[PDB]
Amino acid sequence: AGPRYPVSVQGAALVQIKRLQTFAFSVRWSDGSDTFVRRSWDEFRQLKKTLKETFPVEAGLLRRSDRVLPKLLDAPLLGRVGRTSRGLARLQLLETYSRRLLATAERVARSPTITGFFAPQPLDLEPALPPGSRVILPTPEEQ
């Protein structure tokens, strides 16, 4: 069966959206593919929730190989919250965390949920985002 799963994800970019900025990733998949995509922290929040719906593991009650989702590692809390700051924290955290997902569990790592998560986002499929948007770009690796 042809894999449709990223082997790795790297934090690709920042796009400025409302008091949540949206954060880009680049993931390249076992089929050899490479992708760079934009994501929201709010989008992640759905994404974590969404895996967690597929993974009852989160609390470790069900299994003993069960911390493989050690919930999420997070930097010092809030610091006057700062919604940007939480995206900012989340960017660093999320990349450790996503890297955990591609190592800390196989069972998470391919689940159909994985395929949705790394699948296209319309906002990634929009060449420009609203005028107030600032997009932070990595220097391209490919042509």
Brief summary of the model shown:
This protein has 143 residues and is of the alpha+beta class. It contains four helices and four strands; from the N terminus they run βββααααβ.
Strand count, sense and barrel status of the largest sheet are: 4 strands, antiparallel
- Which architecture does the CATH hierarchy give at level 2? 2-Layer Sandwich
CATH C-level class is: Alpha Beta
Q: Strands across the major sheet, in which order?
A: 3-2-1-4
What is the string of SSEs from the N terminus onward?
Answer: EEEHHHHE
Can you tell me the number of structural domains?
A: 1
Helix share, percent: 25-40%
CATH topology: PX Domain
The dominant shape is globular
Distance between the termini: 30 Å
Q: For this structure, what is the CATH homologous superfamily?
A: Phox-like domain
What's the multimeric state? monomer
Question: Approximately how much beta-strand content do the residues carry?
Answer: 15-25%
Number of helices: 4
The computed structural class is: alpha+beta
Tell me the Rg in angstroms: 16 Å
Q: Care to count the β-strands?
A: 4
Domain PX: 1-125
Subunit structure: Interacts with NOX1, NOXA1, CYBA/p22phox and NCF2/p67phox. Interacts with SH3PXD2A and SH3PXD2B.
Protein name: NADPH oxidase organizer 1
